[PDB]
Amino acid sequence: TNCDREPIHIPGAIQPHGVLLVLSEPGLVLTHASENAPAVLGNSAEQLLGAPLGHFIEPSVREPLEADLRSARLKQLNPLKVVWRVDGVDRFFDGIAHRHQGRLILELEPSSHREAVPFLSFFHAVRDGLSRLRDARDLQELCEAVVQEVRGLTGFDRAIIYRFDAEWNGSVIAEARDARADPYLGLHFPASDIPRQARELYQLNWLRIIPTIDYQPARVRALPGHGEPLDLSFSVLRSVSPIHLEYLHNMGVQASMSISLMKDGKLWGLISCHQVSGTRYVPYEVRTACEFLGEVMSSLLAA
Amino acid sequence: TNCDREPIHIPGAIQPHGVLLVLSEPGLVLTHASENAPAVLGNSAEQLLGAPLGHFIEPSVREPLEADLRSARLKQLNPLKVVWRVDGVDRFFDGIAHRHQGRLILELEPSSHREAVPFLSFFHAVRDGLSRLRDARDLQELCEAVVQEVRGLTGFDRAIIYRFDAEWNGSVIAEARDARADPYLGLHFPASDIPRQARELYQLNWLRIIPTIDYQPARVRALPGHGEPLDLSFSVLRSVSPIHLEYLHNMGVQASMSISLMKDGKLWGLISCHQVSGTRYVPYEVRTACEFLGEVMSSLLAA
Ligand SMILES: */C=C\C1=C(C)C(=O)N/C1=C\c1[nH]c(Cc2[nH]c(/C=C3\NC(=O)C(C=C)=C3C)c(C)c2CCC(=O)O)c(CCC(=O)O)c1C
Ligand SMILES: */C=C\C1=C(C)C(=O)N/C1=C\c1[nH]c(Cc2[nH]c(/C=C3\NC(=O)C(C=C)=C3C)c(C)c2CCC(=O)O)c(CCC(=O)O)c1C
């Protein structure tokens, strides 16, 4: 048994700082809604399950949202602009929608505290970041550039490159840190700290974020006949394995984010980030800029 | 003599669809203004020369603009938001500012016809583009990906990869085209079609755009004692060599854009684009996304 066996892709629950919905196609009837919807959205699961999405959307953004949701080109279209009209009182969300195993999953995170131009911060992050990565003259300089850039953009206490060896053991080959975070640079860890089914999932889904390791999972409720494990492999809000939360607690880490580094189709390593005290809800534009930099680094892993 | 000798970096004039200003430091007094300022800005050179920039800027965007102009971090801060208050009647511009040879040059192009979210189109362009470039499995697939993406983003009739050989002759090794543009794929051209001082300039300044080859150059006027050739090497609006305009006329090309491809610090090739009929004022976000893709391709020129 041991670590390789837990089915981390179907926990039945999400991290409660966003809301997860499942939408029928083509009608966009909600078949599933996470149970934190009252706190986040201002509606109960009973109001949600079996209602059409449009009923809750401010009418002027409604048709474009529905058009996007039916597009597949789906992302490419993320993030979706979601204005949730309840009281109302519009609430604003970035929607991240994806299709997996026959389900259309729409995840809602509250739109950033504004106020700077939308997507300007992404524009600058990836331009400045690309040119620092291109200054690197070898693999070690690349790693140190990436970790400095990611720590700069996010404000995480620690950011490392964690490289896998042939046996899937890993080592900390680059680190940028606040002084206040103990230095992990140079440490090697056994393969079971990132077990096989996690590594397999992380070859497909290149980003995970845990803005606080102390949260109450919000169960995903479903219409009768629906529900039945929801495959959450590509869902950003997926509740993470409790044994990993305990590992982070024991490391003394309150919040985490990691990004897969790919090479020739195979997981090569991770950019891994920790907040040592306090939480870390990384804004959408920052997270996405960091993933973009990880894709650039992955493409450069030919030098 | 021949082609290598013309001093293309100091033509004394600009392409008239934007305005070029030179600003003193730290006071931001205009020492130079291109003579098309009446058409573009609504002020004469006489009103401009020796006035402080702030006098013309809408007061609520004035302090941040001046702060940026004095920053160096200068870009990194481009584009600058420039609201020009004359009549007034605000007019809106993207400012591209740079320092070169001791001058602070501010170039003003009219802000795009709006209306979509600012920088959203850049966000999508570089994300979708990066993932198509990463699908390429060899140099030829890379070239064909780049040319398809750039043509898709811009709408140019033709987009090619033009690769330099050891003697600086070039060949068209990839092409995407409207059918209506003759195919240049496979053609080789002599080194003098892109002469030595152009190639040297294009190792430093990675983008040039000619939205119409038929334009009246707008001379750059200067305060007494100033003026004296303005080095326009890094200026986007720099008027281009008339012999090159004739070459484009003769190719049957009405508008052009090219991007340098760099490898190990040396010019490797160009992404070159043509509009065969009609003009092509590529919006700022599109141009900048194309340059970003050229930087990615340049970084990948290790495979
Ligand atoms: C057998 C069970 C497990 C033991 C024992 C253990 O130590 N982890 C077990 C299961 C497990 N881990 C993860 C995900 C995971 N683990 C890491 C490990 C590290 N983070 C670091 O910074 C370092 C070294 C400094 C190590 C080593 C990481 C980065 C991750 C990814 C998640 C994150 O970024 O925090 C999982 C999967 C958790 C999930 O996706 O649900 C499991 C089951
Ligand atoms: C000796 C004078 C010149 C002769 C003869 C000639 O043919 N060109 C001469 C000078 C010259 N060229 C350029 C810039 C330039 N030339 C090219 C050439 C090509 N564009 C194509 O698509 C192809 C093949 C299909 C060729 C070959 C290009 C791309 C450029 C860059 C400008 C642009 O993108 O249109 C200059 C410099 C012009 C300037 O920067 O002021 C000069 C002096």
Author numbering:
A (entry chain A), B (entry chain A): 16 to 318
Authors' text:
Phytochromes are red-light photoreceptors found in various plants and microorganisms. S. aurantiaca contains two previously uncharacterized bacteriophytochromes (BphPs) denoted SaBphP1 and SaBphP2, which may be responsible for the light-stimulated growth of multicellular fruiting bodies. The classical BphPs switch between a red absorbing state denoted Pr (λmax ≃ 700 nm) and a far-red absorbing state denoted Pfr (λmax ≃ 750 nm).
In order to understand the role of the unusual Thr289 in signal transduction in SaBphP1, we replaced it with a His so that the T289H variant SaBphP1 resembles classical BphPs. We denote these constructs as CBD-wt, CBD-T289H, PCM-wt and PCM-T289H. The wild-type and mutant CBDs both crystallize in the dark in the Pr state in space group P3221. When Thr289 is replaced by His, structural displacements throughout the chromophore binding pocket are observed. BV ring D moves almost 1 Å deeper into the pocket, and its carbonyl forms a hydrogen bond with His289 (∼2.8 Å) and with Ser287 (3.1 Å). In addition, the electron density of the water that hydrogen bonds to Ser287 near ring D is stronger in the mutant and there is an additional water molecule with respect to wild-type suggesting a more rigid and defined BV environment. However, the T289H mutation hardly changes the overall structure of the CBD dimer as the root-mean-square deviation (r.m.s.d.) between wild-type and mutant is on the order of 0.3 Å. Since the CBDs do not form stable Pfr spectra, but the PCMs do, the PHY domain is essential for the mechanics of the photoswitch.
